[model samples]
Target: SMEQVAMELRLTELTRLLRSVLDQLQDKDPARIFAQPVSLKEVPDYLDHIKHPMDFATMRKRLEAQGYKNLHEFEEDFDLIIDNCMKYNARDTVFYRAAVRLRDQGGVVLRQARREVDSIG
Candidate 1:
């Protein structure tokens, strides 16, 4: 199928971009970021393993209680930092780590939700 082939190509492009971002961050930081290398490519597989996605309402409440303005705020700042990195060729991974942390924690919550759903359904 041409459509399926096209979709795979898009996916590959997206994966490459994301992996490049992750790799750049890892290179700059070179710390104990994750026990294993964090590959953006694996995220879809991780999501697929999830029987249930996290409840948006619960996550929103939790973030609000923690004084977060909104979920997009986190990504907004992350985008700015990445932009700065792109403009200046900045090698600092601080911004990358910040974004990765949000993703990692979110993944954790989602996995828990999956567990919950699995138990119930």
Candidate 2:
């Protein structure tokens, strides 16, 4: 019971922090490419290279559905979203650059998530 209490409390702020990151990503991303799943019709052979696809919409669904095991799981999904972008799009392309920027900012949030979670603990 005690462990469950801490776990439940941590998730509230943890999810709140995650939501803020997603909202920022959505607002800052003008193309809205990361906001949804990439359509094969739009980007051919996308899945050929990106074996596992992740996106804001999918993350949001899982987040609301309590699909994550812990904050680390949330972080992995977050990282996966960015990694898939970098994997398919070359560094020279615009998409890769956006992914770079997202990682830079998202890295900060990830660290914040860890520190704050510990602080609450």
Candidate 1 lDDT: 0.40
Tens digits of per-residue lDDT, candidate 1, 6-77, equal: 766655544343333334333433443332422338565544443333322333343334433332443343
What is the clash count for each candidate, in the order shown? 0, 0
User: How does each model score on lDDT?
Assistant: 0.40, 0.78
User: Which parts of model 1 have CA positions greater than 4 angstroms off?
Assistant: 35-121
Report residue 33 deviation for candidate 2 (angstroms).
2.7
In terms of lDDT, the poorest run of 10 residues in model 1 is: 51-60
**What TM value does model 1 have?**
0.30
Alpha-carbon TM-score of each model against the true structure: 0.30, 0.80
- Model 2: which ten-residue window has the lowest total lDDT? 21-30
Residue 28 lDDT (model 2): 55
The clash number for model 1 is 0
Q: List, residue by residue over 21-44, the lDDT tens digit for candidate 2.
A: 567656656677688898989888
